[PDB]
Design a protein around this nucleic acid. Sequence first.
RNA 1: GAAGACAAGUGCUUGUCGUUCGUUAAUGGCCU
Lengths: 475, 349, 493
Amino acid sequence: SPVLQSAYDPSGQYLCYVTVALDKQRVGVQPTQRWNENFLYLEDSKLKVTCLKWVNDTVAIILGMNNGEIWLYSVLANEVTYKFTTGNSYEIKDIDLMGNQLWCIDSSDAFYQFDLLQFKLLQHFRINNCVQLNKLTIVPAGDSVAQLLVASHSISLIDIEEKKVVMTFPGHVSPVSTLQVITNEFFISGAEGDRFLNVYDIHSGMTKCVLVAESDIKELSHSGQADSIAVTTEDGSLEIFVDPLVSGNKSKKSSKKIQIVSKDGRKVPIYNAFINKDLLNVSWLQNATMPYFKNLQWREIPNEYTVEISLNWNNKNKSADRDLHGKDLASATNYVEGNARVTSGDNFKHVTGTVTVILSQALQSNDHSLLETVLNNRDERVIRDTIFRLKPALAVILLERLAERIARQTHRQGPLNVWVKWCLIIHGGYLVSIPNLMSTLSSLHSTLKRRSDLLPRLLALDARLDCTINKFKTL
Amino acid sequence: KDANASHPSHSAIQSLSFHPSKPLLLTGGYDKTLRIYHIDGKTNHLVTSLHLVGSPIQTCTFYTSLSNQNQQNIFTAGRRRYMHSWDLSQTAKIEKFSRLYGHESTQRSFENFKVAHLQNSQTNSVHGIVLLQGNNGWINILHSTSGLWLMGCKIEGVITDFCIDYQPISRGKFRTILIAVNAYGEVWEFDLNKNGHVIRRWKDQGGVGITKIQVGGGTTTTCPALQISKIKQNRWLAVGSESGFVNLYDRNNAMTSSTPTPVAALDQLTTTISNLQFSPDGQILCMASRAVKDALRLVHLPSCSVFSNWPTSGTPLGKVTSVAFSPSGGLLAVGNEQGKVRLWKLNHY
Amino acid sequence: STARPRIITSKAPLLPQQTTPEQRYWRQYTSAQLVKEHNSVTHISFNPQHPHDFAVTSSTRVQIFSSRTRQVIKTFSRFKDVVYSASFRSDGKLLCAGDATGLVSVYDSYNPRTILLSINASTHPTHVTKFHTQDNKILATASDDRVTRLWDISNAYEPQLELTGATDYVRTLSFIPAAPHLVATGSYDGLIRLYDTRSSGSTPIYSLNHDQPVENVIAVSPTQIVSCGGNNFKVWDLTSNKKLYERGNFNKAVTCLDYVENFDSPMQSALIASSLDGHVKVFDPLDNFQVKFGWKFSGPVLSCAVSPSTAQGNRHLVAGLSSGLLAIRTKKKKSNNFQRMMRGSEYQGDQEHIIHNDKVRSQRRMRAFERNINQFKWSEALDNAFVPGMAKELTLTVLQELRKRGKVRVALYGRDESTLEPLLNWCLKGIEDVRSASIVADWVAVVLELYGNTLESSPVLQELMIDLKTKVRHEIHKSKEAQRIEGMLQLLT
RNA sequence: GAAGACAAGUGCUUGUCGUUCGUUAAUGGCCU
């Protein structure tokens, strides 16, 4: 994970998260409800942030870290206000602030107490029987600071006033990662790389119950009334147990599960969830460092849930200027005729040695390779005698075939004009009887009307031809 | 950990760049991809990965304006007639610089570009410029955002490289000097602050086939400053050959002698020089060749001595095609023909 | 900005009988080679499984051809009398051969040497021997003995079902792809029998009352069959037992008939038929079996066949004529360091986040006249149009567009006496058509009104204008005749 | 159709408007 440590404020409005930036750590605060560009860089490439906490008089976060000092950094102005200096030079494993009494752990087990109002160190103070200590929380017994908990691979409650350990607890085989008090009598404890959480009693010493996850445990947050514990696992998911203190009996599994899976099918890791009164704030990394958030009511959500978000996995880059393909949208789309059918306004559509028998055979069948052989003759008396002994039903077919040849071949308007003339004369009586003449002779009527409207244009060319012809015939 | 280990490329990495303020490595190659990674210490990740269609990427550098400090354009080009400019949700604003406003006869290819800044000197309106190689001698200078052809200088012979040197004259005012080279070594120094002219021409002692010039030690086109106050004159000038030699010139006597003697002629690379890059402090010059495996040589400056313990016979380099420094962290991102940008850290910085 | 529109090619209103898309597909069947044969070829049957072969029958010799080489692969010359039919099975392995001596022989494809089976039918000649389509183990043969027989090839000595009840000379039978129990049987007196082999099989379920003799029956559909008989051909709905269409568009009796469905064509399926007039006419059942295209050969055609739907290569039309001719009409169809150099040229963005394609799509190349019009060299554009090898459609396009956008006077201001001669040589050949003469009228009248002074001295253009005068006498008189026949249609309406 | 204003004659005559009223032809062509 690119984010090393992230801590929520109380009541859930911002988080301060630390990250690597060209091997120089930087801390930034992001709102979680609703971009940002304000960070604090660490000026040395060795010193690294180890532990983090908020302060509830501008809002300030606490940076106890590797170099030995504890930084107090105001969120609103990117400036550290004060640095609390540990007398030795050791990293600070954990911090806590309740009241004005900040408490921290040295790497060499030395407790320290710091005052906010006086900016002073109260008591450098060591103990026995705890050779390693890495996590501390204090109890909210009142306004007092007494009986802080401290733990590393075993848990010990230690009273400040008598400077002694009160009661130990059987800890975990790994070092403890999460150690938070929840109510006044139970505190959660979780190791590193362990899928187990225990609510140990602060007075009985016996564990009330144990909370198991599905995977190893990284981050934890809890509601103030101990009804919900929201634990973020390491692999990236979120489990929420409802009423952990209610009465398997000894081990309680995950009540509800929340994962975040992107729309393309890829999985998205989860870090640092937050819970409140009916409010959950799951956090994840949209880009490599930029954190994205989502508020969601978690009681109506079923026992398994996948929040789906929109990563630009294979997104085509639409542009405001560009259309779907190259051009602009203020570019006027030019007219293209393309494959458009072009018609006319007259084209109706469903609105003595003769050759008669070889023409009637060539019209009953659609044998155009033989109709032309019949039509090669130009002896006009034969043309009269063929239409005389022609079937009147086949004459309508003859007019359609003659019309297609005079339309296609404009040079064939010579001989075929006497063929259509002789046919309309002989079978004129039958042609009145058939009513849909615009349907039948549509090819004939369209060819004739198109060849007849040319005439004023051809006459205009001819007399203008004859002006220049008579100009040079005279001289 | 290598920066390409989060998501591998598919072609040879052809150019790298680091963001002048942000942690951001931009990788581009013949994959037609601009893969912007984040640079952690342990876990690098993709910030974004823009794939142009049909447009190979040979050079890709970031650019931040001096005055605005908020534009953060990404310029990429290739063996085409266009240069894709990427600005800095869901979509991406990518305009193409496919318009030579005066003449397309010279630069029919955009693949050799370097982005610098320039001052108007009538007003103090600093703005970016892009400089492009051309047909024979033509280095053409265009406006970075408006796209207008600003000016154009022609050298004799064949261009092989060009670099840009700055010179702060007075308070908040600096003159940009373009240093361009012939194949022979006829290094020209144009003054882009005023109109197209020459400050000086001279001769590199040697360098029969020259590949690269990098002017470093201060503000350069690869690792610039962020404001007019921090713009500093470069202190050294490196002239790289094709026979492996690199001739260094200190600017304190190269601007005066007018036929300057090289300080030292480094010889430890054999094949043709593909990259000369100076550290932003100016103390490590990285010469890289691309015709053989393990062709990286770092030289201590000003001792002009190659480091003995770096690199060894067990370092992963491959055919080194593009090297990148870091402006703050002292990091060194080195490409290869396998498309695995491998990342090192100089621990003194 | 705006992309420049292309100069659109001009178009008149369309003439009747234009080229249909179904005509444009079928006229690709070109390169009609002709192979001489020793007798009247009667049957052509393709290969159903891998259609790269078709079998053509002849006098005592069925020879297998190729779809690739269109040549004789093999010959089958083991026959006493003339072989009548030769149908492949649906597996494509085993082909029949009905012989006129009485007994049929079926053997493996691509192997004349191994006569696999020789079933002895009745002593009458067997005209058609067809294999089952859905089934792959039962042979159905007819004879002049007026009985059809269904032989399982396991028992090639006794007929499994002696299908009787025929009237006279069953010469073509077919199966139906839906029901395997139903066998269509066509006699030679009409009476298209439909037989059932699941029953006793000695009497048809029903018959189709074709009057004239039927020569071919083909299942055009699971519920429709088509009957090739006499001067016309009729289709029948099987379940309704009723004829549906009847197309009398043949001069003589249709003899052979073939059908193909779902082959790559602008229509879904095509039904072809040989007409015994040299004509093979295609029909489609979606267009009510109307005629779409007809090839014409020299002699009458006795056998017609097309390649099946799944040829995946050059498709063939094989038509066999009476004069021993096989007409085949066919529709045809660096260094390894340099690959490691530039590896991302075949990537195309399969896993990257944002894809941005901005390459403008290349157009058709711009012609010579379109370049000059865009560069506004109008005087050079008009001379660029009249290159003699260029089509007459686009010469009208330049004349129209230069008239519309510019003027005809601007293209004629710089003309010389010799430069007008390419212009006047085209209007001699363009005045006859109605399509151009409305544009020829303007483009000649500009010459007559402006260059009427240089006609007085130059005799070369004087001959051109005289020849234009003698051609406009024919054009006007043709249009005067056209108005007379226009005056006819008001008399008879 | 009228007025207000400038050129060619050795002081007025010779035309036209970035003026009002009344009235039915500068070698100059269209990206990537």
